[PDB]
Amino acid sequence: LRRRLKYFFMSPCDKFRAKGRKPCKLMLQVVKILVVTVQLILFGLSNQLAVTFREENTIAFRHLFLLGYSDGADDTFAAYTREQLYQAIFHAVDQYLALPDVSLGRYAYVRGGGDPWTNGSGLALCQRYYHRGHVDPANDTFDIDPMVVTDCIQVDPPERSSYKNLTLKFHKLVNVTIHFRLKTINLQSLINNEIPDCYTFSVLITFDNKAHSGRIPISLETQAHIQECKHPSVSFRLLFDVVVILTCSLSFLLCARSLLRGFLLQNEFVGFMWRSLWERLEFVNGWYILLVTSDVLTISGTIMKIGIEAKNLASYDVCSILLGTSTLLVWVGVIRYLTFFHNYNILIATLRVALPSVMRFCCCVAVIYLGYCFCGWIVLGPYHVKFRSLSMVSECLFSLINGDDMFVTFAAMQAQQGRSSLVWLFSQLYLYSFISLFIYMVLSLFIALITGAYDTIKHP
Amino acid sequence: LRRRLKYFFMSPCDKFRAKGRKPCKLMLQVVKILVVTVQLILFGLSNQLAVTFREENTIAFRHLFLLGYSDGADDTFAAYTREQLYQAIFHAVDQYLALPDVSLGRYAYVRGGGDPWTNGSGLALCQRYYHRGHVDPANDTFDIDPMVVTDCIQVDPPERSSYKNLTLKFHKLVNVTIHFRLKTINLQSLINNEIPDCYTFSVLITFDNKAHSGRIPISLETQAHIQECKHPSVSFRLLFDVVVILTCSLSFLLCARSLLRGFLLQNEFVGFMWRSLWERLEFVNGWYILLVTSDVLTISGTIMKIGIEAKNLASYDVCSILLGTSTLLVWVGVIRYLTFFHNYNILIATLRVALPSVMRFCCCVAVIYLGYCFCGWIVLGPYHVKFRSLSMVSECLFSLINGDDMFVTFAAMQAQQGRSSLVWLFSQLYLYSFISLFIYMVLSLFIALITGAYDTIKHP
Amino acid sequence: LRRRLKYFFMSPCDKFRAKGRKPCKLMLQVVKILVVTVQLILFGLSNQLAVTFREENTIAFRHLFLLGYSDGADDTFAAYTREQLYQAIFHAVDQYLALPDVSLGRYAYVRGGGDPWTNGSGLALCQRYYHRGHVDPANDTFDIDPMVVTDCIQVDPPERSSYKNLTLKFHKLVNVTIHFRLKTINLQSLINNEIPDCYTFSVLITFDNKAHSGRIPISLETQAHIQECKHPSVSFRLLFDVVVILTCSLSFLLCARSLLRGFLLQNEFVGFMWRSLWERLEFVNGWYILLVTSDVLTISGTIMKIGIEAKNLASYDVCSILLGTSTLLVWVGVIRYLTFFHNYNILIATLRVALPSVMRFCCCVAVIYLGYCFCGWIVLGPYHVKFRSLSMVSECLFSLINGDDMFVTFAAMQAQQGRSSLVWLFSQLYLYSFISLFIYMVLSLFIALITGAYDTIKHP
Amino acid sequence: LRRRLKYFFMSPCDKFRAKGRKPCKLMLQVVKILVVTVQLILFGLSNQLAVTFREENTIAFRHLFLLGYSDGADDTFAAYTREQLYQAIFHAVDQYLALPDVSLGRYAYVRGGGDPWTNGSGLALCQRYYHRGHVDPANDTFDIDPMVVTDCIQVDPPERSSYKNLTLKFHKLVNVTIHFRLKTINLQSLINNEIPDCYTFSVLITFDNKAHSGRIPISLETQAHIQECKHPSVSFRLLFDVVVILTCSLSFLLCARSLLRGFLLQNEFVGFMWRSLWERLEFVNGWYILLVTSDVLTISGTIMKIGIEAKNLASYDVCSILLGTSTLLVWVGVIRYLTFFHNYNILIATLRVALPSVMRFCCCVAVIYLGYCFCGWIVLGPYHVKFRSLSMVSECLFSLINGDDMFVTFAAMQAQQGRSSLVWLFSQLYLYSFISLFIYMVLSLFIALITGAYDTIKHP
Ligand SMILES: CCCCCCCC(=O)OC[C@H](COP(=O)(O)O[C@@H]1[C@H](O)[C@H](OP(=O)(O)O)[C@@H](O)[C@H](OP(=O)(O)O)[C@H]1O)OC(=O)CCCCCCC
Ligand SMILES: CCCCCCCC(=O)OC[C@H](COP(=O)(O)O[C@@H]1[C@H](O)[C@H](OP(=O)(O)O)[C@@H](O)[C@H](OP(=O)(O)O)[C@H]1O)OC(=O)CCCCCCC
Ligand SMILES: CCCCCCCC(=O)OC[C@H](COP(=O)(O)O[C@@H]1[C@H](O)[C@H](OP(=O)(O)O)[C@@H](O)[C@H](OP(=O)(O)O)[C@H]1O)OC(=O)CCCCCCC
Ligand SMILES: CC(=O)c1ccc2c(c1)CC[C@@H]1[C@@H]2CC[C@]2(C)[C@@H](O)CC[C@@H]12
Ligand SMILES: CCCCCCCCCC
Numbered sequence A, B, C, D: 001l002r003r004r005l006k007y008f009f010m011s012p013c014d015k016f017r018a019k020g021r022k023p024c025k026l027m028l029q030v031v032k033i034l035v036v037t038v039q040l041i042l043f044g045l046s047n048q049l050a051v052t053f054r055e056e057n058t059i060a061f062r063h064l065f066l067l068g069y070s071d072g073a074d075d076t077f078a079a080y081t082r083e084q085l086y087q088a089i090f091h092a093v094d095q096y097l098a099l100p101d102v103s104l105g106r107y108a109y110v111r112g113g114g115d116p117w118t119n120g121s122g123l124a125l126c127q128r129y130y131h132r133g134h135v136d137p138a139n140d141t142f143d144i145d146p147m148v149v150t151d152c153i154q155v156d157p158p159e160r161s162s163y164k165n166l167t168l169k170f171h172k173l174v175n176v177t178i179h180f181r182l183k184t185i186n187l188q189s190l191i192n193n194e195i196p197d198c199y200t201f202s203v204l205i206t207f208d209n210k211a212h213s214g215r216i217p218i219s220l221e222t223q224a225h226i227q228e229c230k231h232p233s234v235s236f237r238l239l240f241d242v243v244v245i246l247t248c249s250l251s252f253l254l255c256a257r258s259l260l261r262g263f264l265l266q267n268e269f270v271g272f273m274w275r276s277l278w279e280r281l282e283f284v285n286g287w288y289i290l291l292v293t294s295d296v297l298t299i300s301g302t303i304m305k306i307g308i309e310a311k312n313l314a315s316y317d318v319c320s321i322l323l324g325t326s327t328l329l330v331w332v333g334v335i336r337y338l339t340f341f342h343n344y345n346i347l348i349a350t351l352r353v354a355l356p357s358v359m360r361f362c363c364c365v366a367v368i369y370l371g372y373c374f375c376g377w378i379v380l381g382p383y384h385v386k387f388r389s390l391s392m393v394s395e396c397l398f399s400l401i402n403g404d405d406m407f408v409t410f411a412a413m414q415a416q417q418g419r420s421s422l423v424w425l426f427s428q429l430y431l432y433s434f435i436s437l438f439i440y441m442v443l444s445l446f447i448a449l450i451t452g453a454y455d456t457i458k459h460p
């Protein structure tokens, strides 16, 4: 048992020296790192092109259909008069009807296909307003049934104008929407030696009046559905994916075998000694847990990627998250190889022994941080753009801790002095106290904890 | 006495072990944290909607009434010619008269109600100029009586033009103002399942000529008065408020009882020993002082909030400050619970022992900081936008200490080299010396103080 | 001797205990701090108003005289076609002639007064071009006499058009300038209860063609000459100045007496002991040297300020620098009072003992910094806007050391990848190595020096 | 042998004391620093003027030839309709033909000279489109031969319109280009007392349609070819260059002699002792290796510079890199002089002993950093502009480590909450974990390493 336990906790070099077993797992892990990184790089390069295609088409749509649109004005684009709104709506519909003769892209119309489109209709122009709305601010009276009624006009694309009779119910209007679909072919794919695929863009233009504040924001959004073109006329992507799957499966099997052997040795040692939990889990190789997790994530992400590349899925986010997290874990696992050398192991052990106190001090920091977040949100939110939501407040405070965007934060409040002197003085005290406390004391204590851990490692 | 003193300074767990008294106060404080945080979250969510409504209405007013206005131009919006000013004023008044037919919002006119409006008048167009003004820069002569005279034209809203004869006294003009009120109903409230309230916006448009510099800034400001609509036709908010008040009152009573018992024990101990002050106040539980302060603040803020939600008050700033500070204090009080565990108490005690020297070094830093503030204000203020006011100078220097906005600060001065070589060289020396001194030495000394405190704690 | 030496190096409290002499100098220094700070605050408040007046007038002039000018476009404002230049020049002159009927300010014309104006002319429109210029890029030939010839047209202001025959020598044009003066009265002074003064603005509009690059930048500059108006009809500022002068003179006399006392005692001690220099200068009170310097600076600045407020001088920069530096020094001198208390003296002595090593390490840092500055200037200057001049390069590197403007610096180079791959790779290596070296090692060594100094102080 | 070894490792002052040999090499190195710095400064000043000339001409070209162009719009400038593209192309050609009468600069036309221009043609207007292109998105069909066909129209400059019949093949268009050359003389050179040289700008305007996304970006680029003008009519630059070459050659010879001395002494010592490598290379003077490298770099760069100033080369980048790196190395070499003084040697030795552990920890950091880079690139790239490329991701993460651009990074993701909740939550976790880990632990460990090195140096 003692000999076996000594072998189990032996370094790979010393294990090779003792039993002469070949280090298959180490080479397998190196090859796994290489192939996983290559797969991720190829996937990212492939996806960036589709992202660019969709974004460029959407920008072109914004320039084509939004009256008076200019780049960088998406957040403030809005109508303020009734004639402005009518002109915007009519311009959008007229551009839809004129698209074949004006657009630099090649687009095909789509008709029918269910709501909001009737059969043979390409564009749906709908206004949504309250079922009954009586508003008399003069008498301070109102009678509203909040049930929403939708009225849609259907426009058929031209073969190569009742929508002009639209009458908006301004006082009870909830919103206006324009819906239409356009088909295009992604020729750019030829640059990557891929077969072009067929895109259908569903375009939704929203004139939003849910605030009833006299300002109606205007926005354009697109959803892209990608298919394989039914008659395209212009293998080393699936093969690499199955290679990755096989590599990860072999790694998983070997790591599971190692973990099982560790568990069996733990049970044997406990039984022998009996003739604590923190000492029982000392037999657990955490690096192998990390490798098993990475293998599972990589296999799942590779299956999802194979499905996506065949156009049988559109869950890009989940697959990307899985593969990216797996790549991060496999690259973090390289620290294990450095731990076998004394000079690198000094630094890694310093971090390891520092980690618990760092976590506890993070717990101590969190409550003060949350109190400051709530106070800033409630007090400064009505006045400061960076304090409107709790997550935004947390982001602003975290940036201030790191010395970013400090002066603009102060200046936004400076722009409201004299108006509310009490609020300005409170903001001064709040910001100064928070930043001073966090930079003079908290970061210093983190430094002190790390320094103490390093000293403990260097002078045992 | 010795047994009672031992019990008094005993931890809650050990107090429970000794006497068995239930820890009512601890559970009460946990529940207090929960309910206070929930109250603050609900209040902030409610207030953000009103803030958004007011801001959107004001933006719509700026787009409706200010000739040639565009987003982001508030700071520089100004007139420079007489015809520009006339066109702006006439456009504002014409838009006021045309509002019902052009505006996307629904607004009602207000008439009379005292100054500056006569009875039956909706819009007041007033010009203020010196009583006697004779200015002859050709002869370098002037005769001015600085008494201000106001001339107001009253415009009645249309029923669904003497203001065009306005003649401005340009050489003696102090300013021009346009005042009018608009009534609207906040329908957006239905999204939160609230009854819509009735807003009256008082709109003031100012063309300011108090600098007499040939540039007249133009601004629009709104004040919102919120009432309950007199005939609206579309309980678990006041109940939670009284629950919060009761919880805080119980906490206050228990904490006051504990403090009174501590004072009595202190008096008994002093009397017995006599048969200092720093040792006499060791009987004071500062956490209970903080809890009592938080309870008082929360009760006051909750009363003010109840009044506000009934439309009986409009002091949002004071109530928000009270509630936010109380929430901050209750969340800071959570540190006490961590103090009962040794590993967290190490960090908290490190901070506690470091605090006095940190405060003394802050005092040492303050005088140097103030000297730099004054010098930079006097020298760089005529040339640098960030140095025009002392508070602005302090904010800029504090941001520089933290590594924010450094390059733009240098570049603003770079943009004036050659013009004033002496000033540019002085700015170079000033900025470089300040930043170098503060980053190489001051922050380092704060780090050293914290590290020494941590070492003292770890090696007693 | 020994008793006198003991007394000389005694603290003010112990000196009072021993001899009982009143601490006149300490109270004098406190009063000096107060009065100097008040003087600086009043001076800055007074000067800011004049700065604002001049800046607003200049902005109004830019909006009045520059064709197509808009705020924020000063840096890029330029002409690119011949008709653009003609239109700009003619617009400027026409606006000059139309000023009385269009301007919101009140201005008077100035005539004569020497070059560039003849007698009775208000506006001078001058074009400067080479004496002989023959340029034939088709044949790659040129014959230029670089002597500059100036041709000026004089325009008389109207009484309440040969300049339209201007013919520019485009191929040999050096520049075009428009010069004119405007008189105005600063009424805004009444806000501060000051008597309005009379301003003369000299306005220079430059169309610059010294690059001969097809792009002619256009700029407007003003110089303000301030006088007292010769017939204005609408003491506690000079009295405070003489009070400040008297306070500083008394402080100077007392400090000089103390320094003479120290020198005499040093001479006596040296003579007695003889019956080194670093030990001989230990008798010097550096705080009194600083106080004497501040007194001299304050007296000089107060004299200059008295002259300025009488309109007898216009050297605002020198006076402001003197007074600001004096205020900085007097506020730094407050550290001496903290030096008398042990807990503050610990921190001050830590800084004092650290300072020499900090200076030596700054010397070590300077050479590496200069090498990086030169390399970045020569390599990145042709491509990076922030690297065009050596001072700009130094400012950029200093900001990078402190963690400011890093990403924009990287992105400016990113915007030129592919064009010059070698330069982009070099910039990557340069920036990464510089920042890593300075953050990982240099700042850490400064921290280590300060920490070692603090440890030496705490454990003697 | 012992005396010789003692002399070899002796300081220059002690070598002078022992043998009396004059310190020629030290004075030579000082003079080398001076002359190299002067050469670099003169070269940079000379090159900046040419850079400015080229950039100003290119800006003028953008304003002249790009329809509706404005400053700061280079990245977003693009066409979106067919008539927009036609107008832009025709405007460019019309401005080319009208240049002599409208331009503020003086330009000469160039004809012939090879592709893409025929003989006697000044402007080439070429459209590139696929050989065969049939795109039917309605039927989801396409037949494309990806061979590119180019059709060019030649425009002869006017003597002091078939291009209007251009018909673009929009559905198969790859791009459109306009090529033309202009000759000009750089008169600005006279300011620096230089003979003006003759520039030929080759101007390429690209309307790019390689994405086929309905948005066609428009760009203008210039390449400058500089010659001596064949008949110009208006020595202490080459002399200084040969002086620099001679100084560097003498330094190289002396340093090589010293290194040969060291090698011979090393061999003699090894032979004697035999009667290791890390001890064998202790005989190598690394400062002399650095000096030899700097001498070689400076000589090569000076030869390249001599060629460039004669207009026999145009490889500015390589010469600038060589000279800048050499200047950086010579300025770094100044540290050697400080190493001879104990107080400076303390700091330098601290850095020296810290360097190995710093490098090892950099190796440890690199793998985690790369994992984060890959994960962020794959996950956030589709949504975040700063994450589109791996180098961009690395730059963003490095800036975040230093506290720069943090809030904008958070806000870009905030602008997409609700759309993809999973991606937003992942971005929150990713950013917070990365920044917290790197600021709390990594930088702290660097500080600890430097502090430990300093303590080891101070307490041997
Ligand atoms: C009649 C009024 C009753 C008010 C009840 C209010 C609601 C309720 O549960 O309060 C719980 C509190 C306990 O209050 P609570 O604060 O939870 O309990 C005290 C704290 O633990 C205190 O420690 P620190 O907080 O660290 O100082 C400790 O020294 C005291 O010991 P001691 O016993 O020797 O004084 C405890 O009594 O106990 C009462 O208030 C009286 C008990 C009931 C007596 C009934 C008499 C009819
Ligand atoms: C006649 C001219 C009078 C000028 C008065 C000016 C206005 C006024 O109150 O000055 C106060 C100063 C005190 O000046 P002051 O600086 O406050 O006092 C000195 C400092 O405390 C000094 O310490 P350090 O500052 O740390 O070096 C100490 O060594 C000297 O001891 P010593 O006595 O052994 O020299 C003190 O005299 O004392 C006079 O100046 C003479 C006293 C009056 C003699 C009257 C003779 C008729
Ligand atoms: C004939 C060629 C002459 C070339 C002269 C070139 C121009 C000139 O002044 O060089 C100065 C150098 C001195 O060169 P320099 O480098 O200044 O001097 C040497 C360094 O101080 C070296 O220390 P490190 O640099 O720290 O390694 C030391 O060990 C050598 O000791 P050593 O004497 O025992 O070898 C010195 O000679 O000395 C010559 O080069 C030969 C002297 C003249 C012999 C004349 C013979 C006719
Ligand atoms: C070339 C140039 O314009 C220029 C500007 C500033 C500085 C230098 C050169 C070299 C020394 C530098 C200094 C800025 C401030 C420092 C970085 C100090 O913190 C230490 C060394 C200093
Ligand atoms: C022997 C146990 C070591 C476990 C290390 C796991 C590291 C995980 C980093 C995310």
Ligand SMILES: CCCCCCCCCC
Residues within 6 Å of the ligand: B284, B285, B286, B287, B290, B332
């Ligand atoms: C036993 C006394 C402890 C007092 C701690 C109070 C903390 C207040 C933080 C704002």
Ligand SMILES: CCCCCCCCCC
Residues within 6 Å of the ligand: C284, C285, C286, C287, C290, C332
């Ligand atoms: C006793 C000598 C002390 C001198 C201190 C001077 C401080 C000057 C700071 C600018």
Ligand SMILES: CCCCCCCCCC
Residues within 6 Å of the ligand: D284, D285, D286, D287, D290, D332
């Ligand atoms: C005696 C060996 C010392 C070598 C120092 C070289 C420094 C190079 C810095 C780039």
